[PDB]
Design a protein around this nucleic acid. Sequence first.
DNA 1: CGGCTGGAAATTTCCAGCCG
DNA 2: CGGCTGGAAATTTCCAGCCG
Lengths: 273, 273
Amino acid sequence: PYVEIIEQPKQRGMRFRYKCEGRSAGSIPGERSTDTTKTHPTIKINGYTGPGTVRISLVTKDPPHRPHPHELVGKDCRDGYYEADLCPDRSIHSFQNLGIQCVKKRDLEQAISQRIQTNNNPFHVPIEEQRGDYDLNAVRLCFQVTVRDPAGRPLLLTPVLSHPIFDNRAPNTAELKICRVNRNSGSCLGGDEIFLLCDKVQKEDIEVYFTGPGWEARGSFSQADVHRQVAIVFRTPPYADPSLQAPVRVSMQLRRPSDRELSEPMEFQYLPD
Amino acid sequence: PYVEIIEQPKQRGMRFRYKCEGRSAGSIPGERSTDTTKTHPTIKINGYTGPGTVRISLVTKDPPHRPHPHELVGKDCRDGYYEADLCPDRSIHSFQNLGIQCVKKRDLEQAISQRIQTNNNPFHVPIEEQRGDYDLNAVRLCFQVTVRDPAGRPLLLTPVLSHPIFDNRAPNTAELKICRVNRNSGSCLGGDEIFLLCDKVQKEDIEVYFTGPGWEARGSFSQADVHRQVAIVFRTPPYADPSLQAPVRVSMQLRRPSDRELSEPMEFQYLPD
DNA sequence: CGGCTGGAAATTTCCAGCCG
DNA sequence: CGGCTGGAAATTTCCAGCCG
């Protein structure tokens, strides 16, 4: 029999709570889960109906897939994994109640120790490999279903892993926002210096992207002009038509190179010089 | 004889480094230091020359001078205090390799037990009156010099403290710096909105203080206008005289109410409306 | 109306670029 | 080298506006 993932966890949007951030750790939602239409990581077991159990371990994003040092927490969880006895009355299973608790880089080796002890190693990565560089900001759910064989004896199906989940409370995964701007208008020749206040960005990865219908231009600044990740001082780019004779609304917005990700558009209105 | 401080340690702009950064910290410069002519904490022993020793403990900022949890680190340091043989043919003493290593709040209790065990209590504060919170953002060096008397026996002179050395890590005890400003000129009628980029302030304890001979005025903004502690968007106050006939350069600077502290003055040049 | 939880901040580690 | 730095991560604790 074989497990299928008919609903992957939302790749970006969840934040790993340290075992200190309050009482909640979250509840990983599905790839198409909205503030109205809530979906969740669901699997389908092809070719089997009846008694069985499900275990959701966490494993490294990358190919040598060792058990991750972070923990899964919530209903039915224990020692960093989930484990609920499946339902015979259904074949499509959803989990609308699981959270990803990140551990401190300091307590990483005490995490993996517990991985060993509790026999949590979906892909039985030999001990000599428990060592290495654990990418703490990306995990993969590893659904390991157990159904019965013809003789009724428990039959462990192969492991099925999801695509990476990503900790929002991380450098590049946080959202883009333009809180304030000293000026929303300027000259079509550009050159106007603009002070834009935003949310924590990375001077190494950020852009002020200007756009209109068929037009495109970046504002000019540098890493030096990105004051405390939360303010950028740059200069507007020239407009398409330089010798304007009337205004032209275009839209200004923050753009992150790495992801091609944008912020809500702030109307900028180029004017005749 | 009696010790005096010919040169106090620079009160601000220096962050205290933790052990996780090194058993050696930058080194406290003299209050009168500048890129060109470097200065260091110096003391003068009035009425004595020849054999002697000098210990530099750290003690709390306010009156009951309990030995601080923090520790001094650098040449000739050990157990959180400096110690060294006084030059016997000189009377002015410089200390150019002194660093302040801040302990973690958690490790505070281990800190003071070390003060006890090593008998570091310049002002002999009893265990009774040692109890209390320790302001970990402000310390004071406490030079304890020992010379000999004519008969020849070691004579411990009384203790002399410096003025607080403030850890920049703390925005209320830190050095107000104005990094950038979109405009340094405006109208005598005021009203010009200004975007000023500074170092970590505290929305509810910061001010943009304008000034001139017989004139002072605050800029208008609110806590809502203090973006993520490192930017203030305010509006310039009217000048003393609205009938200017030519630029009148006053000085703009950050002021912190809690301690009436100021930042280096940025020239602002009011102009005729 | 006070107890629950983002968003702000305070606190601690780590790191790159540098300058003598 | 290495020690400085200054800046930003990593982590933890704060806090005000919810909410009921």
